[PDB]
Design a protein around this ligand. Structure first.
Ligand SMILES: CCCCCCCCCCCCCCCCCC(=O)OC[C@H](COP(=O)(O)OC[C@H](N)C(=O)O)OC(=O)CCCCCCCCCCCCCCCCC
Ligand SMILES: CCCCCCCCCCCCCCCCCC(=O)OC[C@H](COP(=O)(O)OC[C@H](N)C(=O)O)OC(=O)CCCCCCCCCCCCCCCCC
Ligand SMILES: CCCCCCCC/C=C\CCCCCCCC(=O)O[C@@H](COC(=O)CCCCCCCCCCCCCCC)COP(=O)([O-])OCC[N+](C)(C)C
Ligand SMILES: CCCCCCCC/C=C\CCCCCCCC(=O)O[C@@H](COC(=O)CCCCCCCCCCCCCCC)COP(=O)([O-])OCC[N+](C)(C)C
Ligand SMILES: CCCCCCCC/C=C\CCCCCCCC(=O)O[C@@H](COC(=O)CCCCCCCCCCCCCCC)COP(=O)([O-])OCC[N+](C)(C)C
Ligand SMILES: CCCCCCCC/C=C\CCCCCCCC(=O)O[C@@H](COC(=O)CCCCCCCCCCCCCCC)COP(=O)([O-])OCC[N+](C)(C)C
Ligand SMILES: CCCCCCCCCCCCCCCCCCCC(=O)O[C@H](COC(=O)CCCCCCCCCCCCCC)COP(=O)(O)OCCN
Ligand SMILES: CCCCCCCCCCCCCCCCCCCC(=O)O[C@H](COC(=O)CCCCCCCCCCCCCC)COP(=O)(O)OCCN
Ligand SMILES: CCCCCCCCCCCCCCCCCCCC(=O)O[C@H](COC(=O)CCCCCCCCCCCCCC)COP(=O)(O)OCCN
Ligand SMILES: CCOc1cc(CC(=O)N[C@@H](CC(C)C)c2ccccc2N2CCCCC2)ccc1C(=O)O
Ligand SMILES: Nc1ncnc2c1ncn2[C@@H]1O[C@H](COP(=O)(O)OP(=O)(O)OP(=O)(O)O)[C@@H](O)[C@H]1O
Ligand SMILES: Nc1ncnc2c1ncn2[C@@H]1O[C@H](COP(=O)(O)OP(=O)(O)OP(=O)(O)O)[C@@H](O)[C@H]1O
Ligand SMILES: Nc1ncnc2c1ncn2[C@@H]1O[C@H](COP(=O)(O)OP(=O)(O)OP(=O)(O)O)[C@@H](O)[C@H]1O
Ligand SMILES: [K+]
Lengths: 361, 198, 54, 148, 99, 333, 56, 27
């Protein structure tokens, strides 16, 4: 038409050897992905999910899941679609009997005061919402009207029951409470009782106690086996060094959570240079336990990348004592005052300590 | 639309087009055109009377909306291979067909005849509904989920099973292959992240 | 960041150095004004056709 | 390309000015549609530039491979290693074809969307011109120019 | 594939010729002495429009033109893509056979 | 007709109970049964319960009106008790309007006959009770997460592969939905007709098998597919399995149970599966699947249950341990 | 049967509580009253359901 | 009584949280 892209189909091979723009080099500097984000919200994107109908069958899971504005859209549209469909049916049946024709005769209409589709819709309001305005009566004239009245009553009761259920399971949600648990932006490593450990701090804001709390702790790192079995995300469990031997915790004050680095702990070969900005390593802290009021189990997901782990710092003591009762100064929550410590690895430290003890004794 | 706002599954999910998918869409279009024609007749006929005569186009005015919702509902159930949910859509076609067939034969009662436009449009729309109902029961015939035996369902094509097939032109719902609608999201990526061999 | 913005450039600087250098003030005032005149004549011929048919 | 680009853009300006002059209501709908048109044009440029450059950078190694095989055909067959080079050729041709397919597909996406915009313009212009003509006894001739 | 491309192209050309024909129809009935009358045909309580009379209201012809332009400017693009895709596949088969 | 699985691949525990001295408790337990009823049957009982209540009270209203005689036509000779009642159909419509609290009005209750007041009070109480009970069943029914159990999905058939020297029975279990199942917990049982030195016979014995977690606990955290591997040591009862002894009709089964409360509702849900001997494969590996695109992560569920091979010794766990013990002893000497 | 804000307040009671006596009806005339009736029914149901849930 | 109990004899965790950067969690 008006382009010249088809006139010349030839080519020239004189110009070649064009490369090295250096533009893509800056693109490779983009930060790598985190497993779970700080405020929970796990950053995993499932791919090639074969739906096979397992994402519509559990309808009442979805209805609770959805946001409140979407839930109110479904709420409003369920009721209004039901009202309007049954209004259509009332209009049609009262029209078939002739009660819509004005001044038809003394024939007793099967539903009085039906003089429009507008009054038919108002009549559907009165029936289903169970309001019953005296103007629009249901007479004993035609059997189909009584059948349809029964059906609409049963359907209205069922729809009310379903919406009551979903509102019940939505007003007892948990994600409005998972965010009111507070971790540090960054975790620290320091020696306690002469042994290296990986500290952390977690606290609660709402006065409502969290019952039967539970703190799982995992390391996320690609790791191979001697047999060549490569696992991209080989999660490893870690004990919480709690004295009793269980991992349960009674959370009132901001407590210090840490795992003692014994020979079992997979962090047994960490060095202060081995946890730099781009190092492949990530700690997860799953804080479980129910909400005291509603009795709904909750999680508080959080992570700590390599470039957040900080060597040789101790959390500032947060708890003080006021005149009558204790004090908690949450401004000093994540502050980690410097503390000198040996800069070697956990294995080198253990071997050196063993050799020194053997030589001394 | 609620699961869609959090559809990371559908972020890189897979599809399976039901049998007779081409003929389903082309029939929906071949009836959307004649429903627009019926709307034109309705707006045109009442020009002689002093009452609006809503019963000439508002039936078709809701038929057009119903057809659009029907095709939307069929595509949704096509992405999620959950055919048992289309029973409602199935009954709709046969139910709608029955009602309009009465209207057709009623014109034949009064000797309306093809010489009037409404008879032509109604006849064409009736045979289109017959073919569409044929398609709706074709789905039953193949997949047989309502039948006694186990549903002889098929897995998604191995061409799309691979992660790295980002040129979804051979297998996409017919009204997103005429207009290349699947391209739209890719173009957003072009603005965001440069389009290189990755 | 910087790479994206710089890549997302329409290069009117290059267009200005290309056109204004060669054309100066005479060839541009001939080229561009001839195009404008040509298209104005196209609008005018369509308009006159309409009025004559009327 | 300068002559053809100038011709295209100025014919567009000519057409839009005539439509507005014939049916002054059209500009009220011109503003939203143009804004939508703007987005398409903007996004297409960002995509098409990249795809065009990619297409070119893809085809250069392909011809290179062909030429180099003409050099050492005896050498390549000497090692009985030509299965690897067959797979190299298929990979190069696949890369060139996918780049060109995306290029053509982006071309067709732009054209479909822009011709839908034009179709919407046709409907709006026809409705306004017909409405004004019947109601305001507007000259039929101006309606013809607006449509064409 | 190539036959399908050419069939889409032929139908696009045919449907595309509506534009001229629809313009002629619109203007002709809109300039026919500026006479405005009803259908003037009735049947059993509702007016029944006939074959030609449905092409009467210039609104109908303009809306039909809009639909024809949608079908033309989608069939034509479908034809472009099918021919283009076969062409890109002809290059692939030729560039392998030659090698 | 060859071997019957203890549990089916997707739940539905396949043990046929028999010879129960049924006390009637099963039908005496109505609320649990109603919640376990399929939705069409729940709607049918729902509809029949309401309709029976409506029609029973309709019969009573018609009977009392008949006794008071107001349905016998009369113009001014009577002062009606329940107005507008002039047929049984009228009494049925009246029962509807009272029980579902519609109150259309044309059918009033007057002050004349007190038995109408008594029956009105009884009907109001009964309607409220029936509404409360039906609401309760619906509430518990919508809190069901039996549907959710169909998104905790295991690999079709698990493999036995080496890892860090010794041998473990791996597996792959994953999640499809977007939510997170709190306090997940995995049990793993072996089933075999084990006998004892004293002569005891246990036709289907279940032995708990450790999930070989680092912390020494059951709990697990499940965001992506996992590899649930039981490390086979001298304590485990798979310590004497030979690959040649893993043919189809082996008297073995590996029950796997995955628990964990759902987060949206707060309901505890199991996730069962088993693995017959045929569905166990030797010395094969699950293909690494958690691809990581820049800025995010991915899971290629296409290869969720697609495995490849690797050479491993074709000897029993005991034979492997003993042979590596002899090799270590020789190396030390 | 709307006379004063006393009557209007009683009418709002009878709609949201779903008492629905009958003297104070909604007729076919103005579509805005039907729109407000739908809005009030839905808002009343939402508040009743939410207060139910909190009471549970 | 210069001694502060961490929890009192009736539950009643006797701690006063302070300097909470509140974000409306009350409402
Ligand atoms: C009453 C009068 C109304 C007038 C309007 C009528 C509109 C009707 C349109 C009907 C189109 C008819 C042709 C449909 C057939 C498509 C061809 C087809 O079957 O091939 C589909 C192919 C891809 O399949 P494949 O598996 O790779 O190859 C086939 C297989 N290998 C084999 O065995 O062979 O891929 C293709 O070949 C796909 C081609 C895509 C074409 C897209 C255009 C569709 C129309 C879009 C219109 C947009 C909106 C219009 C609205 C109109 C009314 C409002
Ligand atoms: C007279 C008027 C009465 C008023 C009723 C109409 C009111 C409509 C408003 C309510 C809309 C709510 C829709 C919810 C549907 C959810 C469907 C769903 O997720 O499961 C579909 C279910 C089947 O499994 P289940 O019952 O869940 O399994 C039992 C499980 N263990 C549990 O605890 O829950 O169940 C199904 O599969 C059926 C889905 C429901 C569709 C209804 C179709 C009507 C069928 C009529 C024929 C019934 C024949 C019954 C034969 C035996 C069936 C087992
Ligand atoms: C917020 C919302 C309430 C809105 C209520 C409907 C208002 C439409 C107005 C209208 O003309 O209605 C019409 C129905 O019209 C139909 O039958 C249309 C069917 C529409 C279904 C829903 C589409 C969305 C009314 O027509 P009618 O009831 O037949 O009129 C009776 C005639 N008489 C009064 C002279 C005796
Ligand atoms: C004996 C096998 C021999 C090989 C030929 C088998 C048929 C292939 C032709 C075909 O397109 O099949 C279609 C049959 O669709 C219909 O034909 C619809 C009408 C059914 C009529 C059948 C009567 C019995 C299948 O439709 P589809 O799979 O949707 O078509 C591909 C388009 N797609 C890429 C969008 C999915
Ligand atoms: C869904 C229904 C609406 C359509 C109903 C159609 C059938 C009419 C039934 C009927 O007339 O019932 C009759 C009895 O009826 C009985 O005795 C009913 C027996 C069955 C009820 C118990 C079932 C369990 C009505 O009896 P009545 O009102 O005493 O008859 C005198 C009426 N009169 C006062 C006007 C003269
Ligand atoms: C202890 C006292 C209680 C006494 C009962 C009446 C309570 C309402 C006050 C009242 O009289 O309303 C009246 C004014 O008043 C208003 O309408 C005030 C504005 C409403 C404010 C509502 C809160 C915001 C309503 O009056 P009206 O509708 O404006 O007048 C109607 C005319 N007529 C009363 C002659 C028929
Ligand atoms: C919805 C899907 C699209 C429907 C397309 C409607 C096509 C209308 C063609 C027929 C026609 O002449 O209608 C004209 C436009 O009507 C309209 O404005 C149609 C609005 C849709 C009504 C349903 C008015 O025609 P008229 O002769 O009554 O003229 C009125 C004075 N401008
Ligand atoms: C002018 C003629 C009127 C048509 C205007 C809308 C054209 C869009 C066609 C519909 C379409 O492309 O459907 C899907 C787009 O959905 C959407 O994004 C829905 C947008 C509809 C707006 C109303 C494609 O869905 P697919 O099957 O290609 O992909 C599914 C995996 N997400
Ligand atoms: C010589 C024959 C040339 C055939 C050209 C292709 C015709 C295809 C469309 C038919 C067509 O344009 O018919 C007009 C309606 O427009 C349409 O039907 C437009 C296409 C509909 C797409 C849906 C009727 O216009 P007419 O011929 O009655 O008008 C002037 C009378 N003097
Ligand atoms: C890479 C080339 O792949 C294509 C291939 C086609 C098909 C095609 O007929 N082309 C030639 C036509 C012939 C006569 C040279 C052409 C080239 C430049 C400008 C317009 C045109 N004509 C197009 C058809 C209508 C009249 C004007 C379309 C579009 C493309 C595309 O860039 O996507
Ligand atoms: N007092 C607090 N109130 C609320 N959230 C807090 C508080 N202290 C820490 N956080 C949370 O801990 C995380 C750390 O964010 P931020 O950078 O603001 O704190 P920080 O670096 O740990 O320092 P600090 O403890 O002095 O506030 C955030 O998720 C933040 O919401
Ligand atoms: N078939 C059965 N179904 C249900 N409960 C049973 C059954 N058999 C025994 N029980 C329960 O076991 C307990 C033993 O009571 P009982 O003495 O009646 O039975 P039993 O001595 O076990 O019977 P049997 O001689 O059949 O083995 C009771 O709690 C009884 O309810
Ligand atoms: N992409 C997927 N999305 C969701 N579930 C999947 C997907 N692929 C497989 N599954 C499920 O994983 C389990 C085992 O799948 P696997 O890939 O090992 O075998 P399969 O050949 O797909 O099995 P089947 O014939 O049972 O579907 C089954 O429950 C299957 O439904
Ligand atoms: K009520």
């Amino acid at each position: 038409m008006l382009s010249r892209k088809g006139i010349i189909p030839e080519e020239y091979v004189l110009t070649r050897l064009a490369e090295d723009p250096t533009e893509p080099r800056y693109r490779t500097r983009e930060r790598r992905a985190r497993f779970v984000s700080k405020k929970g919200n796990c950053n995993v994107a499932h791919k090639n999910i074969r739906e096979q109908g397992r994402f519509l069958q559990d309808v009442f899971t979805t209805l609770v899941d959805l946001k409140w504005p979407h839930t109110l859209l479904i709420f409003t549209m369920s009721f209004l679609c039901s009202w309007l469909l049954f209004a259509m049916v009332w209009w049609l049946i009262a029209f078939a009997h002739g009660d819509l024709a004005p001044g038809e005769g003394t024939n007793v209409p099967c539903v009085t005061s039906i003089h429009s589709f507008s009054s038919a819709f108002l009549f559907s309001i009165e029936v289903q919402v169970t309001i019953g305005f005296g103007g629009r009566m249901v007479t004993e004239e035609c059997p189909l009207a009584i059948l349809i009245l029964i059906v609409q009553n049963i359907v209205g009761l069922m729809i009310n029951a379903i919406m009551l259920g979903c509102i019940f399971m939505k007003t007892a949600q948990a994600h409005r409470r998972a965010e009111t648990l507070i971790f540090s932006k960054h975790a620290v490593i320091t020696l306690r009782h002469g042994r290296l450990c990986f500290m952390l701090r977690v606290g609660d804001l709402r006065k409502s106690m969290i019952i039967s709390a539970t703190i799982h702790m995992q390391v996320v790192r690609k790791t191979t086996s001697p047999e060549g079995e490569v696992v991209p995300l080989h999660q490893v469990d870690i004990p919480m060094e709690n004295g009793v031997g269980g991992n349960s915790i009674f959370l009132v004050a901001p407590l210090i959570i840490y795992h003692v680095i014994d020979s079992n702990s997979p962090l047994y070969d960490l060095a202060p240079s081995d946890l730099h900005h781009h190092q492949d390593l990530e700690i997860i802290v799953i804080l479980e336990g129910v909400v005291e009021t509603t009795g709904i189990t909750t999680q508080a997901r959080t992570s700590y990348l390599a470039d957040e782990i900080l060597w040789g710092q101790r959390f500032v003591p947060i708890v003080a004592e006021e005149d009558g009762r204790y004090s908690v100064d949450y401004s000093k929550f994540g502050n980690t005052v410097k503390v000198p410590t040996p800069l070697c690895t956990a294995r080198q430290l253990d071997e050196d300590r063993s050799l020194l003890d053997a030589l001394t004794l | 639309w609620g699961s869609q706002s959090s559809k990371v599954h559908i972020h890189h999910s897979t599809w399976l087009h039901f049998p007779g998918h081409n003929l389903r869409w082309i029939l929906t279009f071949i009836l959307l055109f004649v429903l627009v024609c019926e709307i034109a007749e309705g707006i045109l006929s009442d020009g002689v009377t002093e009452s609006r005569h809503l019963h000439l186009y508002m039936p078709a005015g809701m038929a057009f909306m119903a057809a659009i919702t029907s095709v939307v509902y069929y595509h949704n159930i096509e992405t999620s291979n959950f055919p048992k949910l289309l029973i409602a859509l199935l009954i709709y076609w046969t139910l709608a067909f029955i009602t309009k067939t009465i209207k057709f034969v009623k014109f034949y009662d009064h000797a309306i005849g093809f010489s009037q436009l409404r008879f032509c449009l109604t006849g064409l729309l009736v045979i289109l509904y017959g073919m569409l109902l044929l398609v709706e029961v074709n789905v039953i015939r193949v997949r047989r989920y309502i039948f006694f035996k186990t549903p002889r369902e098929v897995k998604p094509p191995e061409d799309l099973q691979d992660l790295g097939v980002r040129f979804l032109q051979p297998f996409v719902n017919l009204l997103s292959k005429g207009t290349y609608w699947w391209m739209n999201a890719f173009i957003k990526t072009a603005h965001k992240k440069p389009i290189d061999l990755r | 960041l910087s790479s994206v913005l710089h890549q997302r450039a329409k290069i009117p600087w290059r267009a200005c150095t290309k056109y204004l250098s060669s054309a100066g003030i005479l060839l541009l005032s001939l080229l561009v004004f001839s195009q404008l005149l040509k298209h104005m004549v196209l609008v005018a011929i369509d308009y006159w056709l309409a009025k004559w048919t009327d | 390309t300068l002559e053809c680009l100038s011709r295209s853009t100025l014919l567009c300006v000519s057409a839009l000015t005539v439509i507005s002059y014939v049916t002054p209501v059209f500009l009220v709908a011109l503003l939203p549609l143009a804004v939508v048109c703007y987005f398409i044009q903007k996004y297409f440029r960002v995509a098409s530039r990249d795809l065009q450059q990619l297409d070119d950078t893809t085809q250069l190694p392909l011809v290179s491979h062909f030429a180099e095989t003409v050099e050492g055909l005896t050498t390549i067959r000497a090692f009985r290693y030509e299965a690897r080079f067959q797979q190299k050729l298929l990979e190069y041709t696949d890369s060139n074809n996918i780049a060109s397919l995306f290029l053509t597909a982006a071309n067709r996406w732009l054209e479909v969307c822009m011709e839908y915009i034009g179709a919407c313009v046709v409907l709006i212009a026809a409705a306004t011109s017909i409405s004004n003509s019947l109601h305001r006894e507007l000259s039929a001739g101006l309606v013809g120019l607006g449509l064409t | 594939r190539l036959i399908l491309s050419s069939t889409f192209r032929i139908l696009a050309d045919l449907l595309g010729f509506a534009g001229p024909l629809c313009i002629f129809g619109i203007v002709d009935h809109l300039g026919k002495e500026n006479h405005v009358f009803q259908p003037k045909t009735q049947f059993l309580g509702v007016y029944f429009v006939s074959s030609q009379e449905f092409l009467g209201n210039a609104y109908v012809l303009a809306v039909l033109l809009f639909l024809a332009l949608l079908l033309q400017r989608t069939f034509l693009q479908a034809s472009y893509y099918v021919a283009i895709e076969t062409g890109i596949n002809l290059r692939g088969a030729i560039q392998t056979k030659i090698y």
